[PDB]
Each structure stands twice: as C-alpha cells, then as structure tokens.
Amino acid sequence: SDKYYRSAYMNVDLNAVASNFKVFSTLHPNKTVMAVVKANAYGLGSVKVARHLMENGATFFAVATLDEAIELRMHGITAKILVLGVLPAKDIDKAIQHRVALTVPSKQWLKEAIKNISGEQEKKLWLHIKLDTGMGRLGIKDTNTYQEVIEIIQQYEQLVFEGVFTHFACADEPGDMTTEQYQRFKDMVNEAIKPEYIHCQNSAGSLLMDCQFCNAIRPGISLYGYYPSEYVQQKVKVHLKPSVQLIANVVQTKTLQAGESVSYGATYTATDPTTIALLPIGYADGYLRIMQGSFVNVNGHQCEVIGRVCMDQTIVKVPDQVKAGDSVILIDNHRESPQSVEVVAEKQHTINYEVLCNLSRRLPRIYHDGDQRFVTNELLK
Amino acid sequence: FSDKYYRSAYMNVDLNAVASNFKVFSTLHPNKTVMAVVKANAYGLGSVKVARHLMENGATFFAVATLDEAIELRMHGITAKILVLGVLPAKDIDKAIQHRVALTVPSKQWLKEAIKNISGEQEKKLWLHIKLDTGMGRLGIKDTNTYQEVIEIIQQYEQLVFEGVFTHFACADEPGDMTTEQYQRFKDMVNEAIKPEYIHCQNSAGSLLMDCQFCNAIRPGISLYGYYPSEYVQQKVKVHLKPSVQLIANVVQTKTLQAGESVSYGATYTATDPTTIALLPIGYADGYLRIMQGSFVNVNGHQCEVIGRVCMDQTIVKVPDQVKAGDSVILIDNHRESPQSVEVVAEKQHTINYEVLCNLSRRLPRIYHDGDQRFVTNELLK
C-alpha cells in the first residue's frame, strides 16, 4: 500500500465492482462476461479491478490497447484478454508472445499483421473479427469481405478465428437502430462458420436485451456502478452500486469581510462577511474549470464552488463552523445525490464516462474490500 | 531506457524547446534564481524528464504543487532545491524534512500544527517559504503583525529556516493596476522584517512583463513549455516562446460512408454525399474530450473535421479520398498560429491552454525529443 502526501483522493469500492459484475452474470448465466477494463477500468485502476474480478469468477477481459493488456499480464492476470482497438501491425509478435487476442477491423489490417509475424513467436494468434453493423467506426461491413477474412485466417494454422463481434450505436436510447443492427449482425454471422465467441452487448445491451444468439457480453461502465443513460436506468430493474467517491479535506479557511476579495483565477468579492475554504484539488486532478458554480458536500453542508477552479486548488463558500481538516465530497457514491457522477457530468456538459476518465494520475486510489484498505499512488511507483 | 508503446497515438515533447524557453527567463533575469514550475507533471509533459533536462541546462530550483510531486522528483535523481507550493498535511512534516523539500507556510495556524508533528527523528533543516496574501490574490498571511510573529516562531527553532517569502498576483496576465498595487503591498510587508534568501512574486506573466528588482527569484510555469499565459501577454511582450507539445495519432482504418449511413454514438453525423472517413485510435480517455467534435485536425497537410461523437478510445474524421491507414494526424500542433494550436483547442474546449495540457492522460506515451535522440515514457508499462 503506497503512501500519499496530500488530502485529496478517490475511494474505489471493489466490493461494489464485484457486486455489479454479479449482476451481469446473473442476468446472463450462459454467457461469458467479458469484463471491460479499458482506460484503466474507467479510471478506477485496471490492475486492481481485474485482480479483484478474477477472484470473483471473471475469466475474460477486454481492453482498448495492447499496452493495457500487457499491463494486466505484468501484474499476474492470467485470464483471456481481447484488445478492442487496432494494433499497429509491427507489434504483432508482442500480442502473440503475451497471449492477447486481437481485433480484426479490415482485410488490409489482417494482411499487414501476417507479414509482420516473424516466425520467432510460434504461439497462436487469437482473433476476433469486428463487424460494422451501422456504427460506422471499426470493422468489416460487407459479408463477402467477412467471408474472405475468415478464409485467410483458416489458411494459417497459427491464426485462429476465435470470435466475432459488433458494437451498437444507440443501445442506450429508444429507437429501432439497435434491433436493425442486431438483425444485421446475425445475418452476417449466419453467412459463415460460427466462431467460439459471438458478442454485441455493452452495458446497455447487456441490461436491456437477452440476445440468445450471442454467448458473450461486454459490460463496461455498469461494472463500476453507473448506467449508460437515464433511459436505461429507468427501463431496467436491477440495482447498480456506484464505486467511486472523490474526496478532499479543507486545508485552510479565511473570513472575508464586507467589500473584501480574493482572486483564484477571477475575483470573488464578499458582499457580506463570508467564510471561504481552500481545497487541495484542481483541474490538473480532473476537477475541471467548468465545475465553477457547482456544489460540494462539506461535512453535510451543500457549498458553492466560487471563483475559478485553479490547477491545484479550489475555493468553496462555507459556513463559519467549517475548519481545516473537514472532509469534502466532490463526487459521491450514490445515484440520487447533488454530487452524483451524473450531476457532475451535467455541470461538465458531458456524460458520466468522461467525468470518470478525467480523473488524473495525481489522485491516489484508495481501494476498499471489506475492512481492507490499500492505496495506489502513481507518482510514487 | 526508452519504454515500448503499442498504439499509434502519442505526445511529442520537445525538450530542446523547453530548455530554450527556460533560457529566455534566465536571459531576461540573469541575476535571479529561476524557480522552474514543474507541478502537475510539468503541465502534462512529464515532470521527471523535464526536471532532469532542465538540471542539465542550469536549473537549480524547482516548484511543485504537492509533496508527492517533490518525492517523485527525488526518487528519480533530482537533487535540486524543491519548493512545495501547496499546503502540506501537518502529519507529513517529517517526510518533507527527510527528503529536503521546502514547504509553503500559508498561516500561523499551519506552522504551529507542523511544529507539533516534528518527531525529532528527522533532524535536517526544514526550509520554509512564507506565503503572503497581498490584498487581491491567493490566500496566505495578510497582516504584517502576523508575518512578523511567524518569522519569530521560525527563529525560535534552529531546525526551522526562514528561506523565502512570496506572493501570487491576481490578474498579472491582464491590463490593470492590480499588479502594481499588489507589488507595492508585497514590498511594504517584506520591508517590515528581516529579508530571507529568496523573495519572489512573478509567475510567467510577471516574469515576462516586469523586472521586479526587489525580488531575487521568479516562478515561470506554462511559459517554460512554450505558451503565453494570455493573448494580452503574448501581444505585450516581443520575446519568442517555442511550443513544446504535439499530439499525434495515425489513421487505423478508412471507410466510405454512403448517403444515409451514420457514424458513432447517437448517429449524430449522417452522410448526405458519399464521403470518406478515417478512424483514429485516440479519444476522451486520452484527454481529447467529447467537446472536440466539430473541430479540425491536420491529416497529411489537410484540414479535416472531427465528425460524429468523440469516443473513449476513438475519434472519427472526415478526410479526402487519398487518405489511408498509416497516415499521421496532428491533433495538437507545436505552433502558436495554427488551427491545431493549444489555444485554439482551448477555445473549442471553452477553457484555457493550461487545462488542455493537463487533460492529456497517462495512456498517452510521451516521446521526448532532444536533438537526434528520442526516448519514450509509457506509464502503463512501468
């Protein structure tokens, strides 16, 4: 457990994460739950989340990049891992060496990948073909190309057609786009041999749909306790446990008399005699400038963020009784909270996903697992 | 050593530019200590590599925001003086002492709490820089009597050394008399007690716009990395700063949308004509935020719109037909007068250059350039 030397941090509740994972296993008992731990597990810390999820039955992870997969492998993760992004073809041997499954986005990529296999790694290359069913991002859109790519893969004993998958553009909102995409996915997959893993559902799809034709799901944000939209939250009857709190303690208070100001990026002048509190957190921590004017919870009291948020500091208008040492909840681990991740996303003019991703390496993650507490502080690694 | 990296998205960090920008401040203030501000991981560039490179270019004193930042420097061989600008939790006082890290005194109360936590097990000198609140600016000691009492407390203990005194000016990057009135208040306060070794009030804007003979040290920050703290400062001073950052990603896939076909979440871009799109392996988890939708990036010389929603790991760009997988894209360019300048990216983000830089996440490898030499830091593979 690392030390840390500033009173700002994230509480990461690993018991909540395990409980949320259990929700997906329970909803889909016959599917492999491919736990999405990309982008450092949406800010929570991919190594600690993956380790904890393996102790709770997880056997397959998905990440965005090979670096993310190697990071898991370096820290004892023995489960299957799929890279969802496109690997630079020159790095093919490293994927093979570390038994990491790769996404095939195109016939062109596959041909470049094969040319870079040196023969010095003879282990299998496991491949999941990505189909573009209307998202318009990565993948093969044409059935003929899909078949040609399967055939190329079957010509090489080293290359294994392990899976096939697609991504839904609008699964978190009502409309027929998702039904249409799903039908297109089944139509394409039924035109060739079926691989071992067939998957299309992220959090929203995993919560709203059965998808009997598929045998794996890819829950991401919902593993960490958040719904992908309010529509999905309202439409489903499971309970998700938010896993993150963002906390900082007041390091200094001052009382501004009438007509007195302080400048933290812009002038705030006290009209009445008001007390302010200085928090040791700022926009370099991911608590962005736009959080100006939002409210934080200081010892039970809703308190406005005043002046501009600075790189390393934030000022808050507080009651007189507030003092140095008092704990402040900037992001709370409850859905129905003025400091919920969704309310913070509204203030940020964005979505919950990004609120979480913004939280920088400077914040220690304090992991909770029952009574057990351990700290990761990236700066001292 | 140089880390490997396994996705074609990265930052180019030009260490020669950083050294050149540092040299600007040394040259403008040849008799002052240039206290190089490398807080927040050197505004995203990487504090360890910037500090090492700046030490090789004559830097002898760094400022950081937190003790963790200072210890990080110490663990990677940085032997220069270091000042922590933030308020240290009083229980951590022995760790500051152990690692010869100077601390900011913000209040008499803090100093009294700090002294109570000195165990006697770390006997090195504790260097202290007193922060003054000169009216308008940041919090600190506001009253001269309290300033004197704090000096007196420090002089009671041989272990505690009154090493410096400082303030931070409100609005030094904008036109007005606020800076002048504040500077005068700073001098008035400092002249009421013995002068410590370091006297400092100037950040980037103050270091560029003012001499300040009364001071013997400056604290340049964002300008070390090649950016002006405001357009006013850029226009007012006729010195040249070299932007140090490029953000780059290569096209991984190109596809052609037909009339009626959509792209990304919510299907917010629909093709009307047949148009070519390119997929970049970078997104908002890298700090290229959702709001960048509708901005332009430079693909092989061509200005190209970011279309559909920016994803966590992916960004889609409308491109000419000749664009293909492998082509390099400049998302943030190392020139001030560029549609991909950090300032234009800040405008699109409804923020300031500082935050654009700070947003860039640990997932991005930093590729350091120093002449012909290239070395990579990839945080994921530590």
UniProtKB/Swiss-Prot annotation, chain A:
Q: In which pathway does it act?
A: Amino-acid biosynthesis; D-alanine biosynthesis; D-alanine from L-alanine: step 1/1
| Cofactors, names only | pyridoxal 5'-phosphate
Active site (catalytic residues): K38 (proton acceptor), Y264 (proton acceptor)
Q: Which GO terms describe its molecular function?
A: alanine racemase activity; pyridoxal phosphate binding
Q: Keyword check for Cell wall biogenesis/degradation, yes or no.
A: no
Q: What's its EC?
A: 5.1.1.1
Q: Which Gene3D superfamilies match?
A: Alanine racemase, Lyase, Ornithine Decarboxylase, Chain A, domain 1
The task this protein performs is described as: Catalyzes the interconversion of L-alanine and D-alanine.
Q: Which family does it belong to?
A: Belongs to the alanine racemase family.
Q: Supply the PANTHER family for this chain.
A: ALANINE RACEMASE, ALANINE RACEMASE, CATABOLIC-RELATED
Q: What is the protein's given name?
A: Alanine racemase 1
